[PDB]
């Protein structure tokens, strides 16, 4: 029952890249010119865990270049992955502390929030017409401003970013609405193993607090745990 709705689809949104931010490596460069050309160049992009081709948990529903960067709307659909998450969320004291202000607890949305607090794009190395490959949920992307906001509804998600203008939501909405088995080929052991890998990423929380402040999700209310 409460589990049935716990394992329901979960939407995820955020910038894959921020034009105002200059990456730390020239291979992370991705300016508006390139993004918009590529978009007009390009079947939806798969959505996986930490770029794991065996850990695909959904698909990207909308992609849009906006004033401040490239924004993408995605949806976690894999029943297998969602179930794994549901089970773990019951064992997270972090998830047990509950959400902020007036938001209602959502153990699962909250868990994804805490584990894959970031988004990481996978595109062709700038230095035939399928530039983008996929988007990956991860503990922290290499590109700043890439905070990941999980939610049960697309509108509610896009509505978490102050930058986005009502007009941007329309481009996205146009997309995710027209978009509409289980691609997951991993398990809990994988995620767990993948979790230790994240315990050793230097400055994980600082980069996330930064990404949260830069993209204005610090301003609103969400299930973001960073």
């Amino acid at each position: 029952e409460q589990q049935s709705q716990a394992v329901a689809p979960v939407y995820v949104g955020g910038f894959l890249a921020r034009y105002d931010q200059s990456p730390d490596e020239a291979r992370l460069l991705l300016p508006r010119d390139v993004v918009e050309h590529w978009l007009h160049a390009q079947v939806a992009l798969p959505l996986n865990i930490n770029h794991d081709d065996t850990a695909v948990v959904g698909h990207v529903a909308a992609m849009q270049s906006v004033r401040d960067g490239l924004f993408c709307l995605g949806c976690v659909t894999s029943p297998r992955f969602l179930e794994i998450v549901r089970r773990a969320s019951e064992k997270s004291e972090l998830v047990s502390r509950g959400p902020v202000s007036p938001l209602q607890p959502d153990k699962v949305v909250e868990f994804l929030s805490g584990s894959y607090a970031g988004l990481s794009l996978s595109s062709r190395r700038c230095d035939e017409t399928t530039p983008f490959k996929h988007v990956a949920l991860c503990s922290v992307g290499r590109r700043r401003g890439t905070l990941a906001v999980y939610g049960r509804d697309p509108e509610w998600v896009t509505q978490r970013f102050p930058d986005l203008t009502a007009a941007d939501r329309d481009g996205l909405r146009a997309q995710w609405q027209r978009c509409g088995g289980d691609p997951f080929r991993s398990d809990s052991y994988g995620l767990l193993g993948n979790s230790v890998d994240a315990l050793y990423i230097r400055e994980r929380l600082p980069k996330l607090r930064y990404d949260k402040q830069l993209v204005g999700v610090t301003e609103r209310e969400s299930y973001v745990k960073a």
């Binding site: 894959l16 890249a17 291979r27 992370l28 770029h51 990481s120 794009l121 996978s122 595109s123 062709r124 190395r125 700038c126 490959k133 990956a136 992307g141 290499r142 590109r143 890439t146």
Partner: peptide, 4 residues
Amino acid sequence: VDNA
């Protein structure tokens, strides 16, 4: 490919 570049993965972020």
